[PDB]
Amino acid sequence: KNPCCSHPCQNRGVCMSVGFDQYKCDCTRTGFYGENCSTPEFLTRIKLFLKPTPNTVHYILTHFKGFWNVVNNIPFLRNAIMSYVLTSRSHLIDSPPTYNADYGYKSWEAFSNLSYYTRALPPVPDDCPTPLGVKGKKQLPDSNEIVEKLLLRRKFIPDPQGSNMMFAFFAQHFTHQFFKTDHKRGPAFTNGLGHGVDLNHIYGETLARQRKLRLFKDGKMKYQIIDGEMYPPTVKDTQAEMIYPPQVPEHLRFAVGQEVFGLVPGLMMYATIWLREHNRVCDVLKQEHPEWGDEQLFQTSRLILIGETIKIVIEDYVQHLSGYHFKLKFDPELLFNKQFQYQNRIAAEFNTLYHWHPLLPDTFQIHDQKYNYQQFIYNNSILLEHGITQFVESFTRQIAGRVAGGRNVPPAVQKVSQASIDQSRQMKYQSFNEYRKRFMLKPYESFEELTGEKEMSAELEALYGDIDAVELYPALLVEKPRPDAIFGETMVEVGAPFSLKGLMGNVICSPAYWKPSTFGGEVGFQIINTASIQSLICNNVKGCPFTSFSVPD
Amino acid sequence: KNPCCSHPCQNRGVCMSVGFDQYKCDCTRTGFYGENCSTPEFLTRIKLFLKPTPNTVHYILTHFKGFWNVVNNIPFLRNAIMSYVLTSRSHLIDSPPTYNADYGYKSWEAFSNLSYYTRALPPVPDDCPTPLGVKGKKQLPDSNEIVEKLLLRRKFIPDPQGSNMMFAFFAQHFTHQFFKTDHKRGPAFTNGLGHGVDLNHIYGETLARQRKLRLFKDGKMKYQIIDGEMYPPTVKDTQAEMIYPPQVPEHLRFAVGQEVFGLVPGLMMYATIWLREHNRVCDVLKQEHPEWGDEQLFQTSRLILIGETIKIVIEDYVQHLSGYHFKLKFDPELLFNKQFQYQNRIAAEFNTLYHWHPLLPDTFQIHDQKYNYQQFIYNNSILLEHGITQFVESFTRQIAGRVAGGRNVPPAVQKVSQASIDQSRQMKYQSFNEYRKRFMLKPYESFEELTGEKEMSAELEALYGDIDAVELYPALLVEKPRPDAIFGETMVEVGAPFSLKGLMGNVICSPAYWKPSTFGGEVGFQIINTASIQSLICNNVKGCPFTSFSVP
Numbered sequence A: 001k002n003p004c005c006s007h008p009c010q011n012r013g014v015c016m017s018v019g020f021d022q023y024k025c026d027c028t029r030t031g032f033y034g035e036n037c038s039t040p041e042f043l044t045r046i047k048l049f050l051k052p053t054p055n056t057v058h059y060i061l062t063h064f065k066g067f068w069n070v071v072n073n074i075p076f077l078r079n080a081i082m083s084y085v086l087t088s089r090s091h092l093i094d095s096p097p098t099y100n101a102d103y104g105y106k107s108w109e110a111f112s113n114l115s116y117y118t119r120a121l122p123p124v125p126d127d128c129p130t131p132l133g134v135k136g137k138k139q140l141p142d143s144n145e146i147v148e149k150l151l152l153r154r155k156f157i158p159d160p161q162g163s164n165m166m167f168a169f170f171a172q173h174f175t176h177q178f179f180k181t182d183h184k185r186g187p188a189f190t191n192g193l194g195h196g197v198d199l200n201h202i203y204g205e206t207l208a209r210q211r212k213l214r215l216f217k218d219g220k221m222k223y224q225i226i227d228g229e230m231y232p233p234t235v236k237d238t239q240a241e242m243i244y245p246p247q248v249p250e251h252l253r254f255a256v257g258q259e260v261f262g263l264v265p266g267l268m269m270y271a272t273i274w275l276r277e278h279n280r281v282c283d284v285l286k287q288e289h290p291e292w293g294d295e296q297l298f299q300t301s302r303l304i305l306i307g308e309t310i311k312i313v314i315e316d317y318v319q320h321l322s323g324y325h326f327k328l329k330f331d332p333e334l335l336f337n338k339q340f341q342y343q344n345r346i347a348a349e350f351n352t353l354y355h356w357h358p359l360l361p362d363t364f365q366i367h368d369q370k371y372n373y374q375q376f377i378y379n380n381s382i383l384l385e386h387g388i389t390q391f392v393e394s395f396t397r398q399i400a401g402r403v404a405g406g407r408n409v410p411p412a413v414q415k416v417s418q419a420s421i422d423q424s425r426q427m428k429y430q431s432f433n434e435y436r437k438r439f440m441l442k443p444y445e446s447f448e449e450l451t452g453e454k455e456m457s458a459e460l461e462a463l464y465g466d467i468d469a470v471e472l473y474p475a476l477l478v479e480k481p482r483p484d485a486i487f488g489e490t491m492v493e494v495g496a497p498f499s500l501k502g503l504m505g506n507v508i509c510s511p512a513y514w515k516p517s518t519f520g521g522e523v524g525f526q527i528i529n530t531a532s533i534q535s536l537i538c539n540n541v542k543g544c545p546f547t548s549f550s551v552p553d
Numbered sequence B: 001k002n003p004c005c006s007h008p009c010q011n012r013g014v015c016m017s018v019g020f021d022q023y024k025c026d027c028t029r030t031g032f033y034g035e036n037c038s039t040p041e042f043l044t045r046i047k048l049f050l051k052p053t054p055n056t057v058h059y060i061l062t063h064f065k066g067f068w069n070v071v072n073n074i075p076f077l078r079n080a081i082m083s084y085v086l087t088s089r090s091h092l093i094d095s096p097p098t099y100n101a102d103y104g105y106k107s108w109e110a111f112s113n114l115s116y117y118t119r120a121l122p123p124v125p126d127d128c129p130t131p132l133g134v135k136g137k138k139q140l141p142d143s144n145e146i147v148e149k150l151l152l153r154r155k156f157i158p159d160p161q162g163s164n165m166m167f168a169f170f171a172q173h174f175t176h177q178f179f180k181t182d183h184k185r186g187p188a189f190t191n192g193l194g195h196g197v198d199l200n201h202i203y204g205e206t207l208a209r210q211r212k213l214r215l216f217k218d219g220k221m222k223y224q225i226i227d228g229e230m231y232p233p234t235v236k237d238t239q240a241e242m243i244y245p246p247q248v249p250e251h252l253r254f255a256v257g258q259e260v261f262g263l264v265p266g267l268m269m270y271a272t273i274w275l276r277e278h279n280r281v282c283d284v285l286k287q288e289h290p291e292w293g294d295e296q297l298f299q300t301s302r303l304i305l306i307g308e309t310i311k312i313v314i315e316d317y318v319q320h321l322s323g324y325h326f327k328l329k330f331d332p333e334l335l336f337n338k339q340f341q342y343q344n345r346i347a348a349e350f351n352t353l354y355h356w357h358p359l360l361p362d363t364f365q366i367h368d369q370k371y372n373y374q375q376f377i378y379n380n381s382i383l384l385e386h387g388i389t390q391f392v393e394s395f396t397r398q399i400a401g402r403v404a405g406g407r408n409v410p411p412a413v414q415k416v417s418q419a420s421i422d423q424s425r426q427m428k429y430q431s432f433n434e435y436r437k438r439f440m441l442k443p444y445e446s447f448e449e450l451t452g453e454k455e456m457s458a459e460l461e462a463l464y465g466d467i468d469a470v471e472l473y474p475a476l477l478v479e480k481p482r483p484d485a486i487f488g489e490t491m492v493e494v495g496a497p498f499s500l501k502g503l504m505g506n507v508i509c510s511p512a513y514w515k516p517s518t519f520g521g522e523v524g525f526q527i528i529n530t531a532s533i534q535s536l537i538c539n540n541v542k543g544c545p546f547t548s549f550s551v552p
């Protein structure tokens, strides 16, 4: 019935019903006119003709290494390039945010209610001819059949880019401070009201929890000392609730900022390292400020660690997955002369696309031991047996799975993968092709074009019938990867805007915050601008083991 | 003992303690350098030497009537001028926000906790030589003594700008959506978590309260018809709680968004009027969109009303207030090629400077009747007796009191005035002069310079001893008014940045929102862009009485 069900408005124009039988497109500031915002005004024809395709730009960034080695070493060029990267990427994000699961039109409820994920595309209206709008069959395919035929791993497919378990667990640990789906009320809702990198997965989401985890001496967080090494405190000692199955003995019930980080020893590894880092920075600041009290020591350490996080994400983590010969830079000053909003709201689609379960290995190799999922899960004694050093050394050397390219989701997390499909349907996601359009990509014209292959594409056809009916999550995981890359085109072109906006949008990157006095002075400031994944481990892990997000060659 | 107690860092530098006896100034992006951020850069001392005083800028805007009168009618020039007015003001506001009453250094707790008012200036550190830091006497003067000698009305002083009761109640009604002090917690905390113009004083602060006030038909808000006229619903009906004394009977306990608007019939008047406007807009939107449901009709009406509010506040309210010949313009597009943050956090100091009690008259005159405070307070019964039309006609013609110049606070609200001073001290406000500097104003060199007068300046020296020890709130009320103006310069040069930032920083003013589809098409969009205080009354008040913010 609803005339906007066909999504007729192109190029980010806004659809609106005008009576029962008609719609109107609001083309305001799209760069297009016409009844569907599909006629480029003169200046847009210029930009469009000159705009190089993402696969073209990816090629340039991933070749000509000698050229990039020069660019990387003349700050003016490196600054200029990193700047354009930042501004052109984040330009694709609505800020202040707009839609959520319950509102396909602008509303104060959608704007102001922080309990919702925001939405990059509005939900499909409730009464449309087909679940995605007007394209596809009256009912979407069985999600289980989708997972089995297209997603489930037959043979482990290693990541060609060489991503390891340090990468995989960093990704899980980092993103779960802002992907905290509140399933008690629905997939549309989040428990992370900071909607960004606030490090609540270390410090706790609420003040009450933070007070349970803090030592209230020297700004430090509570800990226990096992084998001369520092670990998180217990649930018993903190009264900070955690999710642990009954059979987990209480001395192994570690208490950390995020309730679920006891699920995997890989997560508890990072929680332990970051906890050490907090108390390390406390020691540094106390030496620099012996007049300071516990509260200021705590708050300043937190701000610094937020800065470390952001620095490491851009210059080690995003750097790794990009494959760029160009050296990414964390530098808030790049935006001080640019139009940029220092705020962000976590999008549900960003959550969906970050469901990188194919990364997970068939078993976890630590030292000379292999653990299946039954053995690894909720087993902190594994962490204690080997220690963090061995954990880093092993995880640095174990390869992760390729995310794109299909058929690499471990059967152990089958239902998780199916849930991603089901929940996206509950939240009335639009199609994969609509999301490509939303981020200035050409929609795929056929199933074979999407996969670059004849087998899986054929399965997609028999299930979906129309290429415009393929859903966001499955299509991201079966898309043709870029040459020897972990991801396909759409993952990166949709992902990076969400990510870079979230990172640079952080309040500490704003002019009023980005100054030495915010971080306790010059020494504190320096801790941020010299941070790396290697330094994070070297400072907090015994023996200073080598580490990296890729397996050594 | 705190080295930063003297507020050594000038020009918005950041003080930090380095050891028990030493400090360091962070002069980053101040445009200054040196130990105390006192020495200007070349670029800045040039910009400094050629930037005119606000008193000069004020004169220019308040004279040359003939010149401005043609400027107002050339859209290009009006836009350019309005564009600068916006950008210069707002740049004085830290955004994203920084300090609050509990944090004199930047912290995640200060940034993220919305239950606090933010602070334009950090609190005086606890362990300090004097309550204000370093200057002044060991103990501040008795707050009641300040009120009595300097603030209490001895004889009504009318506003020379002619502000009326329509103005005074608009001011109170509009600001009390974002000045909602959580007194149970402390003066440092707010119940207005939206921190701006969200019209929670109409729709309620929470979804739960909103659903008690809504009708869930045609997007409308609940109401009752009394003597053929639309009035807010009751507490009995909505179950939305209100603050009323037991003396008020059930049928007179009107329920509106803001819990305290039962206190004053002038507030309930505006509540009623804005209620009617909402339902009026629903009717318009329904004619345009027969296909729309109740929920979309409600939300779109709300967005439109937010727009009407910002429009009316800038082009009528701040316009009257300013006394400018230039016609201020509400136009979000003026900022689309400027750097500007569409976010805001309500400053405690913004709350304090808005304590404009001297506006209040000796009595309230509705038609042939006069009511003292005791009779007027919580009296919905006399709202029904006269009706909104009569309320508007009367309020338009009754003059308000002058806010600056001292000694014009109604004795009836004496202890409110004292509470304003006490709460300032509880929140550890810095001195008036520090706040002058904070907003790029020359500090006052003497008491006499502050009042331009001999008698009150003498009392201030007896009480405070040092000009650098005078507190923000009393100084604002005794400051030498601008000529024939309601305010002195400090009220304006501090208040306008808070105010314009919070107006233009509203989400509907952002590029993603400022478009006709947001408001249901051009018909809805046009409701915003042609709204005024006179049209708001003509549309929703029987008889379409003339109305203004100044007396006829």
Ligand SMILES: *[C@@H]1O[C@H](CO)[C@@H](O[C@@H]2O[C@H](CO)[C@@H](O[C@H]3O[C@H](CO)[C@@H](O[C@H]4O[C@H](CO)[C@@H](O)[C@H](O)[C@@H]4O)[C@H](O)[C@@H]3O)[C@H](O)[C@H]2NC(C)=O)[C@H](O)[C@H]1NC(C)=O
Binding pocket: A113, A115, A185, B206, B207, B208, B211, B239
């Ligand atoms: C952000 O959006 C969320 C999703 O809409 C909001 O969560 C929802 O909040 C509502 C309202 O608090 C809650 O509904 C409530 O329904 C009952 C009435 O509708 C209420 O019980 C009432 O019983 C009597 C009337 O029925 C009345 O006399 C009594 O005083 C109660 O008022 C019941 O307790 C229930 O809580 C939804 O359950 C909730 N939904 C979800 C999925 O969480 C959230 O509030 C929004 N946040 C903000 C700040 O507005």
Ligand code: COH
Binding pocket: A168, A169, A171, A172, A175, A179, A180, A181, A182, A264, A351, A354, A355, A356, A357, A359, A360, A413, A416, A419, A420, A423
């Ligand atoms: C790199 C990303 C990554 C990794 C490595 C990872 C590794 C692992 C892992 C390793 C041993 C296990 C047992 C799980 C198991 C789960 N994951 Co992930 N997950 C990841 C990204 C996500 C995200 C993102 C969500 C949903 C976020 C939310 O809303 O809470 C998720 C959801 C889940 C859920 C809840 C289902 C749902 O929210 O729909 C389970 C259970 N999973 N995952």
Ligand code: COH
Binding pocket: B168, B169, B171, B172, B175, B179, B180, B181, B182, B183, B264, B266, B351, B354, B355, B356, B357, B359, B360, B413, B416, B419, B420
């Ligand atoms: C802006 C103009 C204005 C007007 C016209 C006005 C008119 C009136 C009025 C009759 C019309 C009465 C009976 C009062 C009485 C009060 N006002 Co005002 N007030 C005004 C501005 C304010 C502000 C601002 C606050 C503090 C708001 C907050 O924190 O909630 C305030 C606070 C109060 C308080 C709270 C006391 C405290 O602890 O601070 C009382 C009582 N008053 N006021």
Ligand SMILES: *[C@@H]1O[C@H](CO)[C@@H](O[C@@H]2O[C@H](CO)[C@@H](O[C@H]3O[C@H](CO)[C@@H](O)[C@H](O)[C@@H]3O)[C@H](O)[C@H]2NC(C)=O)[C@H](O)[C@H]1NC(C)=O
Binding pocket: A206, A207, A208, B113, B114, B115, B116, B185, B186
């Ligand atoms: C914003 O900051 C507020 C001020 O710190 C904070 O309010 C404080 O909240 C804590 C909750 O942990 C309360 O702590 C006490 O609460 C009860 C009752 O006493 C006890 O069971 C606790 O153990 C503890 O003693 C404080 O009373 C409360 N303080 C005030 C002045 O309200 C808010 O919680 C902060 N907001 C957010 C979102 O974190």
Ligand SMILES: CCCCCCCCO[C@@H]1O[C@H](CO)[C@@H](O)[C@H](O)[C@H]1O
Binding pocket: B148, B149, B152, B153, B154, B455, B456, B459
């Ligand atoms: C309502 C009157 C105030 C009562 C409190 C008395 C405090 C001292 O009030 C005195 O009042 C005089 C009136 O013109 C002033 O000239 C004096 O300067 C003032 O100190």
Ligand SMILES: *[C@@H]1O[C@H](CO)[C@@H](O)[C@H](O)[C@H]1NC(C)=O
Binding pocket: A374, A375, A376, A379, A381, A382, A383, A385
């Ligand atoms: C957890 O790991 C320990 C070894 O560290 C092992 O002995 C134990 O059986 C494991 N728990 C399981 C497999 O449930």
Ligand SMILES: *[C@@H]1O[C@H](CO)[C@@H](O)[C@H](O)[C@H]1NC(C)=O
Binding pocket: B006, B008, B034, B035, B036, B038
């Ligand atoms: C800086 O301020 C301090 C405040 O005590 C003052 O004593 C000192 O002379 C000033 N120094 C300079 C270089 O301005």
Ligand SMILES: *[C@@H]1O[C@H](CO)[C@@H](O)[C@H](O)[C@H]1NC(C)=O
Binding pocket: B247, B248, B371, B374, B375, B376, B377, B378, B379, B381, B382
């Ligand atoms: C309101 O009306 C008159 C004022 O003259 C007074 O007699 C009456 O008691 C007042 N009622 C309330 C509830 O204040």
Ligand SMILES: O=C(O)c1ccccc1O
Binding pocket: A318, A321, A322, A354, A491, A492, A493, A494, A495, A496, A499, A500
């Ligand atoms: O930064 C990216 O390129 C990116 C892409 C996809 C998902 C998460 C990401 O950080």
Ligand SMILES: O=C(O)c1ccccc1O
Binding pocket: B318, B321, B354, B491, B492, B494, B495, B496, B499, B500
């Ligand atoms: O708009 C102003 O100039 C102003 C000044 C002081 C207080 C509130 C205000 O809106």
